[PDB]
Amino acid sequence: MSLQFIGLQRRDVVALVNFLRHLTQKPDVDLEAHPKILKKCGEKRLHRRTVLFNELMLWLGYYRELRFHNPDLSSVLEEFEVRCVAVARRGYTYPFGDRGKARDHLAVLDRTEFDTDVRHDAEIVERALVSAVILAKMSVRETLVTAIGQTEPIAFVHLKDTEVQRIEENLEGVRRNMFCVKPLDLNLDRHANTALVNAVNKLVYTGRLIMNVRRSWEELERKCLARIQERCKLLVKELRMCLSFDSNYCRNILKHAVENGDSADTLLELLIEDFDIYVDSFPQS
Amino acid sequence: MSLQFIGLQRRDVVALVNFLRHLTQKPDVDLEAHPKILKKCGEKRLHRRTVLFNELMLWLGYYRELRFHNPDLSSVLEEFEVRCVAVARRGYTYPFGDRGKARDHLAVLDRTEFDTDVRHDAEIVERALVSAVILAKMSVRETLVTAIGQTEPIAFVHLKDTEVQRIEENLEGVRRNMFCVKPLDLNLDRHANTALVNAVNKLVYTGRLIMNVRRSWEELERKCLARIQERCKLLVKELRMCLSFDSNYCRNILKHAVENGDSADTLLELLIEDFDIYVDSFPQS
Amino acid sequence: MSLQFIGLQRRDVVALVNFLRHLTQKPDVDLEAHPKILKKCGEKRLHRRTVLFNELMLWLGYYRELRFHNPDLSSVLEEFEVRCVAVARRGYTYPFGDRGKARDHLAVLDRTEFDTDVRHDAEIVERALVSAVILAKMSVRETLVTAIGQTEPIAFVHLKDTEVQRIEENLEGVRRNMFCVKPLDLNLDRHANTALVNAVNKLVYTGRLIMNVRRSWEELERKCLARIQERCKLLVKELRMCLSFDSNYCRNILKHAVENGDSADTLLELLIEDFDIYVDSFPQS
Amino acid sequence: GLFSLDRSYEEVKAAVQQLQTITFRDATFTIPDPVIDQHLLIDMKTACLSMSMVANLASELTMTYVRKLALEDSSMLLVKCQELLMRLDRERSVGEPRTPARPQHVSPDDEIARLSALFVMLRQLDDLIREQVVFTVCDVSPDNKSATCIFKG
């Protein structure tokens, strides 16, 4: 469970442990966004092997921390449907030019539900929002897309330039640290807007929030495994260079597959429990 | 964003903002309810111009926390919308002394829906409950009052006084503070009561809830819109007396009408940002 | 919350009073599981009349803490129905070698319901998991016992034994203390499992959680009441010897039977409000 | 015939026996079971398909039309019929249903083939849909042995 490193002094070891304890509460949760933390590995100061190895441990413990926190979306996914159901009852009483065209959108809005897979979750968020913004635009008699295959872009309606520039800073700051979000001091409600428009705006906000969290999480998750294979392919080339009991031991550890981040967990646990034996293979000082 | 007070020490400004930030958590959410906050303004200790200005800052900032917290009974509203629909399936089966007299109330019950305006909702539930609470009386063959001009006081039927007293104190505690509703441990159904009557009671409960919250919210807002208009009406008089550039500057900031709480938020956002130029107007200590 | 004791030293009273506030947090939530706390009660330091009375206070107060920390499964118990319907969601689509037999299991899975009363659920869970696992094994074509009168054990399917150890250890720490929940046991593999088993295992874990907590609370209450009802009998037989007023006041209090949820909580208040007067009888120090 | 597929169950095993013996205002005459050798005969199978196709093909199909007809309101009951489509027995939960389920995106031409296959099954069912009188007895002989019926058809 405890991580191990070779060249670094205990100050930097504790620095990385504290960097990892505070991951969720840290802004910009991305190891590639903190180049000084990678410089803490002591690039250009220690041997190529020890640099590569402390970096592999950094990436493995970072990916393990991601899995350990693993941002749950249970409450917002249910709040999104609870919020979604509002627009239907707000739109029923409203008079439309062609009520059947909007009844189709209310029906798309009311059959919303989330499949168990995380993969199909983002698609409902987008289809309902397309059904809702188009509904709100029919509410205001605003121009609609007509070309075949074209679709209205999801965008907030009747909101100030400063106000959308302000909420987009929030929705962007969700992308750089998903696990925690700070709700805006500003409220999307407006006295000038129709109640349906306000419900649509809050629905769009929750939808863009869900989409920003999902896409960024999956991006980090695949990137970590990409760097991990990047490291193991080079580390094997380094270990082949100098055969000994312990250099030949780390290679037989690295022979295994890297896919499927549970396999990275396997590699990290086997790499820790067998650390004592090959620690002398890596030069230090 | 940063409220500005003239003659108020940070010990009192911290108290005034701590009163706002925890407003959802306090019972009796009314600025007038807490007179100590009205005393923290410096009234009868500061000059009148500064007194009215600090009172005005308090009112604009309290109105803002109202617009922000902005209760939204949607999750309960859908349950009420379902229970009203069940009430008619119960009332249709049970034999009635008059097939046609109850037809009016059942059709009134079928016609319930929530208008695009939120403000109509409290009316609907009212015309919902006159539809039901009268009808349940015919259910027990009780002789409901038919004197003109009184309709039918809303009331739970065939219930323990121990229970109605508790449910009444619950509705009252919701009345004073409408944001942190506390879920009941009570089971409103009683096997002793008629199966229809358990449904009428589970309907009337949520109906009283939605009515009380909407009424109390409108009652607070309808008051604050008068309070801020009075503060500006009195402050423009005091500001007329001085011809200093900043004294004319504040009158020009106050020219805009406080109606339509959106303007109440615009005036505050403006009144903060230009505070530095005219702060010279008001005496200090 | 106003507990008192006759002969205990004040420093010992501090530990006993603090045991109330730190009860649920610590592992091994059972009064016997802590013998030190019962040596703190006053055996062989205080007279038998004092010891048997002191244990009445500890057992009634412990029964009071247990009901304050009213363990409330309904939040998770609702999610059990989501997970169970999610299991049937895959039981229909999944092909079987013989489907006319598994259709019985899917129907029997559709039956499961939650009564508002707690005591039947430890049966319903068993009716489901046995019906579910007999389904899940047929996903991977496991050999099934046909001998009449045999129930298949309730065990996780295609979860590694080292994983099963870590998950059953969490279940054992749940059986140790119902209040503390650590659902941090999610190591299931994306690749290694099939469509049914992925949900059958999570359903089995939630059912084992719900049943373990129900049984743990039931054991706690079963021991508490039998202990209190015996200590009352011992003390009533003990004070019969004395004639003095302060002692007879105690028997007049203890005539009332402790058998109820509400009766111990009434006796403890009635035995606390009148403590000033009968403490003279019990010899102290 | 609809139970011919379910002879494993004791409840159906008993209900079939109850349907088997009609109880009429006269001496009773049990009806032979169509099921035999664990397997249904081809005619009843085709007729049960004619019924179940009409029972299932209509449920997924009629919403695409009722949603459009309910707009007009001249008849004034198709809005009430949109709720009739739901086929719910209990009053709706606080969950999904507010509108009936309708097919999505359906490819332009197959909708004609499903429509026409709905009508092909009524033709298979028509022989059983409407029995027709062939006699109307005016007087009966004693012992109810001869009767004198005016012929119909």
PDB file of C-alpha atoms in Angstrom, chain C residues 27-182:
ATOM      1  CA  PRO C  27     -15.829  -1.222  16.295  1.00  0.00           C
ATOM      2  CA  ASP C  28     -17.503  -4.011  18.238  1.00  0.00           C
ATOM      3  CA  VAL C  29     -20.742  -2.225  19.135  1.00  0.00           C
ATOM      4  CA  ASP C  30     -21.991  -4.472  21.930  1.00  0.00           C
ATOM      5  CA  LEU C  31     -21.970  -3.936  25.683  1.00  0.00           C
ATOM      6  CA  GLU C  32     -20.453  -7.330  26.385  1.00  0.00           C
ATOM      7  CA  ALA C  33     -17.909  -6.803  23.602  1.00  0.00           C
ATOM      8  CA  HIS C  34     -16.499  -4.187  25.957  1.00  0.00           C
ATOM      9  CA  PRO C  35     -15.775  -5.881  29.306  1.00  0.00           C
ATOM     10  CA  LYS C  36     -13.765  -2.920  30.628  1.00  0.00           C
ATOM     11  CA  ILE C  37     -16.916  -0.798  30.568  1.00  0.00           C
ATOM     12  CA  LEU C  38     -18.652  -3.401  32.749  1.00  0.00           C
ATOM     13  CA  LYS C  39     -15.730  -3.534  35.177  1.00  0.00           C
ATOM     14  CA  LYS C  40     -16.211   0.235  35.267  1.00  0.00           C
ATOM     15  CA  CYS C  41     -19.778  -0.496  36.410  1.00  0.00           C
ATOM     16  CA  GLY C  42     -18.720  -1.148  39.985  1.00  0.00           C
ATOM     17  CA  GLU C  43     -18.472  -4.845  40.777  1.00  0.00           C
ATOM     18  CA  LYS C  44     -16.574  -5.526  44.027  1.00  0.00           C
ATOM     19  CA  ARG C  45     -16.006  -1.826  44.565  1.00  0.00           C
ATOM     20  CA  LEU C  46     -19.675  -1.148  45.345  1.00  0.00           C
ATOM     21  CA  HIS C  47     -22.265  -3.183  47.208  1.00  0.00           C
ATOM     22  CA  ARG C  48     -24.483  -5.667  45.301  1.00  0.00           C
ATOM     23  CA  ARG C  49     -27.468  -3.327  45.553  1.00  0.00           C
ATOM     24  CA  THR C  50     -25.326  -0.661  43.959  1.00  0.00           C
ATOM     25  CA  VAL C  51     -23.917  -2.961  41.285  1.00  0.00           C
ATOM     26  CA  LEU C  52     -27.235  -4.395  40.136  1.00  0.00           C
ATOM     27  CA  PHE C  53     -28.699  -0.905  40.019  1.00  0.00           C
ATOM     28  CA  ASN C  54     -25.713   0.540  38.188  1.00  0.00           C
ATOM     29  CA  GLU C  55     -26.150  -2.055  35.475  1.00  0.00           C
ATOM     30  CA  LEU C  56     -29.775  -0.972  35.068  1.00  0.00           C
ATOM     31  CA  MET C  57     -28.622   2.538  34.259  1.00  0.00           C
ATOM     32  CA  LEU C  58     -26.001   1.305  31.799  1.00  0.00           C
ATOM     33  CA  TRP C  59     -28.360  -1.052  30.003  1.00  0.00           C
ATOM     34  CA  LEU C  60     -31.226   1.431  29.742  1.00  0.00           C
ATOM     35  CA  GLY C  61     -28.854   4.159  28.572  1.00  0.00           C
ATOM     36  CA  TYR C  62     -27.229   1.830  26.059  1.00  0.00           C
ATOM     37  CA  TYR C  63     -30.641   0.806  24.763  1.00  0.00           C
ATOM     38  CA  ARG C  64     -31.358   4.528  24.495  1.00  0.00           C
ATOM     39  CA  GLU C  65     -28.235   5.256  22.439  1.00  0.00           C
ATOM     40  CA  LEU C  66     -29.099   2.344  20.166  1.00  0.00           C
ATOM     41  CA  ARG C  67     -32.532   3.806  19.428  1.00  0.00           C
ATOM     42  CA  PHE C  68     -31.176   7.328  18.955  1.00  0.00           C
ATOM     43  CA  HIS C  69     -28.774   5.938  16.392  1.00  0.00           C
ATOM     44  CA  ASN C  70     -31.893   4.327  14.901  1.00  0.00           C
ATOM     45  CA  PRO C  71     -30.365   2.302  12.098  1.00  0.00           C
ATOM     46  CA  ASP C  72     -32.285   3.272   8.984  1.00  0.00           C
ATOM     47  CA  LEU C  73     -31.945   0.920   6.023  1.00  0.00           C
ATOM     48  CA  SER C  74     -34.737   2.456   3.953  1.00  0.00           C
ATOM     49  CA  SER C  75     -32.333   4.684   1.996  1.00  0.00           C
ATOM     50  CA  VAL C  76     -30.351   1.631   0.873  1.00  0.00           C
ATOM     51  CA  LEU C  77     -33.482  -0.524   0.901  1.00  0.00           C
ATOM     52  CA  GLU C  78     -34.955   1.581  -1.896  1.00  0.00           C
ATOM     53  CA  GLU C  79     -31.777   1.110  -3.932  1.00  0.00           C
ATOM     54  CA  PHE C  80     -32.108  -2.649  -3.466  1.00  0.00           C
ATOM     55  CA  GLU C  81     -35.280  -2.556  -5.558  1.00  0.00           C
ATOM     56  CA  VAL C  82     -33.520  -0.583  -8.299  1.00  0.00           C
ATOM     57  CA  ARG C  83     -30.730  -3.172  -8.358  1.00  0.00           C
ATOM     58  CA  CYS C  84     -33.180  -6.071  -8.295  1.00  0.00           C
ATOM     59  CA  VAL C  85     -35.257  -4.728 -11.170  1.00  0.00           C
ATOM     60  CA  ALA C  86     -31.911  -4.151 -12.901  1.00  0.00           C
ATOM     61  CA  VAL C  87     -31.157  -7.860 -12.464  1.00  0.00           C
ATOM     62  CA  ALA C  88     -34.470  -8.798 -14.081  1.00  0.00           C
ATOM     63  CA  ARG C  89     -33.676  -6.273 -16.818  1.00  0.00           C
ATOM     64  CA  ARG C  90     -30.950  -8.717 -17.857  1.00  0.00           C
ATOM     65  CA  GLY C  91     -32.688 -11.974 -16.941  1.00  0.00           C
ATOM     66  CA  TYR C  92     -35.125 -11.537 -19.827  1.00  0.00           C
ATOM     67  CA  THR C  93     -32.621 -10.705 -22.562  1.00  0.00           C
ATOM     68  CA  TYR C  94     -30.087 -13.366 -21.544  1.00  0.00           C
ATOM     69  CA  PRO C  95     -30.393 -16.734 -23.326  1.00  0.00           C
ATOM     70  CA  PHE C  96     -30.529 -19.979 -21.382  1.00  0.00           C
ATOM     71  CA  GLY C  97     -30.291 -23.643 -22.291  1.00  0.00           C
ATOM     72  CA  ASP C  98     -33.681 -24.260 -20.681  1.00  0.00           C
ATOM     73  CA  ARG C  99     -35.685 -21.063 -20.289  1.00  0.00           C
ATOM     74  CA  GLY C 100     -38.940 -22.521 -19.048  1.00  0.00           C
ATOM     75  CA  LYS C 101     -37.275 -23.231 -15.704  1.00  0.00           C
ATOM     76  CA  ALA C 102     -35.529 -19.860 -15.305  1.00  0.00           C
ATOM     77  CA  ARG C 103     -38.807 -18.097 -16.080  1.00  0.00           C
ATOM     78  CA  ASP C 104     -39.956 -19.277 -12.661  1.00  0.00           C
ATOM     79  CA  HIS C 105     -36.923 -17.620 -11.110  1.00  0.00           C
ATOM     80  CA  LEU C 106     -37.524 -14.369 -13.007  1.00  0.00           C
ATOM     81  CA  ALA C 107     -41.165 -14.317 -11.861  1.00  0.00           C
ATOM     82  CA  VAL C 108     -40.099 -15.038  -8.264  1.00  0.00           C
ATOM     83  CA  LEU C 109     -37.574 -12.222  -8.534  1.00  0.00           C
ATOM     84  CA  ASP C 110     -40.333  -9.878  -9.711  1.00  0.00           C
ATOM     85  CA  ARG C 111     -42.250 -10.606  -6.492  1.00  0.00           C
ATOM     86  CA  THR C 112     -39.827  -8.977  -4.052  1.00  0.00           C
ATOM     87  CA  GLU C 113     -41.288  -6.090  -2.072  1.00  0.00           C
ATOM     88  CA  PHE C 114     -40.421  -4.068   1.020  1.00  0.00           C
ATOM     89  CA  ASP C 115     -42.864  -3.965   3.893  1.00  0.00           C
ATOM     90  CA  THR C 116     -42.748  -0.837   6.031  1.00  0.00           C
ATOM     91  CA  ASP C 117     -42.060  -3.223   8.938  1.00  0.00           C
ATOM     92  CA  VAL C 118     -38.513  -4.448   9.297  1.00  0.00           C
ATOM     93  CA  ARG C 119     -38.839  -7.989  10.563  1.00  0.00           C
ATOM     94  CA  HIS C 120     -39.845  -9.787   7.357  1.00  0.00           C
ATOM     95  CA  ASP C 121     -37.062  -8.500   5.056  1.00  0.00           C
ATOM     96  CA  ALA C 122     -34.440 -11.008   6.218  1.00  0.00           C
ATOM     97  CA  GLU C 123     -36.827 -13.563   4.769  1.00  0.00           C
ATOM     98  CA  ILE C 124     -37.563 -11.772   1.482  1.00  0.00           C
ATOM     99  CA  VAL C 125     -33.861 -11.275   0.775  1.00  0.00           C
ATOM    100  CA  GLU C 126     -33.309 -15.008   1.131  1.00  0.00           C
ATOM    101  CA  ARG C 127     -36.202 -15.680  -1.241  1.00  0.00           C
ATOM    102  CA  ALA C 128     -34.519 -13.464  -3.844  1.00  0.00           C
ATOM    103  CA  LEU C 129     -30.793 -14.238  -3.737  1.00  0.00           C
ATOM    104  CA  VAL C 130     -31.383 -17.989  -3.868  1.00  0.00           C
ATOM    105  CA  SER C 131     -33.663 -17.374  -6.832  1.00  0.00           C
ATOM    106  CA  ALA C 132     -31.125 -14.973  -8.314  1.00  0.00           C
ATOM    107  CA  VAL C 133     -27.970 -17.061  -7.926  1.00  0.00           C
ATOM    108  CA  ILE C 134     -29.682 -20.162  -9.318  1.00  0.00           C
ATOM    109  CA  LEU C 135     -30.220 -17.854 -12.269  1.00  0.00           C
ATOM    110  CA  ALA C 136     -26.661 -16.495 -12.337  1.00  0.00           C
ATOM    111  CA  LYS C 137     -25.024 -19.929 -12.266  1.00  0.00           C
ATOM    112  CA  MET C 138     -27.052 -20.907 -15.332  1.00  0.00           C
ATOM    113  CA  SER C 139     -25.420 -17.937 -17.022  1.00  0.00           C
ATOM    114  CA  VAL C 140     -22.127 -19.850 -16.834  1.00  0.00           C
ATOM    115  CA  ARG C 141     -23.712 -23.331 -16.756  1.00  0.00           C
ATOM    116  CA  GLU C 142     -22.634 -24.359 -13.259  1.00  0.00           C
ATOM    117  CA  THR C 143     -23.601 -27.812 -12.027  1.00  0.00           C
ATOM    118  CA  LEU C 144     -26.769 -27.487  -9.943  1.00  0.00           C
ATOM    119  CA  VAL C 145     -27.878 -29.720  -7.080  1.00  0.00           C
ATOM    120  CA  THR C 146     -31.155 -31.489  -7.818  1.00  0.00           C
ATOM    121  CA  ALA C 147     -31.514 -33.237  -4.451  1.00  0.00           C
ATOM    122  CA  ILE C 148     -34.783 -32.112  -2.908  1.00  0.00           C
ATOM    123  CA  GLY C 149     -34.523 -30.095   0.285  1.00  0.00           C
ATOM    124  CA  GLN C 150     -31.211 -28.458  -0.650  1.00  0.00           C
ATOM    125  CA  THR C 151     -30.698 -24.705  -0.968  1.00  0.00           C
ATOM    126  CA  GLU C 152     -27.766 -23.425  -2.974  1.00  0.00           C
ATOM    127  CA  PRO C 153     -25.430 -21.362  -0.774  1.00  0.00           C
ATOM    128  CA  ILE C 154     -25.463 -17.610  -1.252  1.00  0.00           C
ATOM    129  CA  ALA C 155     -22.034 -16.793  -2.648  1.00  0.00           C
ATOM    130  CA  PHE C 156     -20.440 -14.453  -5.145  1.00  0.00           C
ATOM    131  CA  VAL C 157     -19.998 -15.867  -8.633  1.00  0.00           C
ATOM    132  CA  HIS C 158     -16.770 -15.462 -10.593  1.00  0.00           C
ATOM    133  CA  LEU C 159     -15.219 -13.157  -7.975  1.00  0.00           C
ATOM    134  CA  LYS C 160     -11.674 -14.083  -6.985  1.00  0.00           C
ATOM    135  CA  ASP C 161     -11.259 -15.734  -3.575  1.00  0.00           C
ATOM    136  CA  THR C 162      -8.882 -12.978  -2.478  1.00  0.00           C
ATOM    137  CA  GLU C 163     -11.562 -10.518  -3.604  1.00  0.00           C
ATOM    138  CA  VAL C 164     -14.232 -12.552  -1.831  1.00  0.00           C
ATOM    139  CA  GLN C 165     -12.157 -12.348   1.344  1.00  0.00           C
ATOM    140  CA  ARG C 166     -11.958  -8.560   1.135  1.00  0.00           C
ATOM    141  CA  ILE C 167     -15.688  -8.226   0.489  1.00  0.00           C
ATOM    142  CA  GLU C 168     -16.824 -10.682   3.169  1.00  0.00           C
ATOM    143  CA  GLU C 169     -14.463  -8.998   5.617  1.00  0.00           C
ATOM    144  CA  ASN C 170     -16.341  -5.762   5.006  1.00  0.00           C
ATOM    145  CA  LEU C 171     -19.576  -7.661   5.513  1.00  0.00           C
ATOM    146  CA  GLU C 172     -18.209  -8.988   8.801  1.00  0.00           C
ATOM    147  CA  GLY C 173     -17.302  -5.480   9.871  1.00  0.00           C
ATOM    148  CA  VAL C 174     -20.896  -4.624   8.997  1.00  0.00           C
ATOM    149  CA  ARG C 175     -22.198  -7.439  11.185  1.00  0.00           C
ATOM    150  CA  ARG C 176     -19.951  -5.963  13.879  1.00  0.00           C
ATOM    151  CA  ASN C 177     -21.585  -2.529  13.650  1.00  0.00           C
ATOM    152  CA  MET C 178     -24.686  -1.663  11.652  1.00  0.00           C
ATOM    153  CA  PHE C 179     -24.218   2.107  11.785  1.00  0.00           C
ATOM    154  CA  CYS C 180     -20.885   2.230   9.903  1.00  0.00           C
ATOM    155  CA  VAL C 181     -21.030   1.492   6.163  1.00  0.00           C
ATOM    156  CA  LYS C 182     -17.931   1.245   3.932  1.00  0.00           C
TER     157      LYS C 182
END
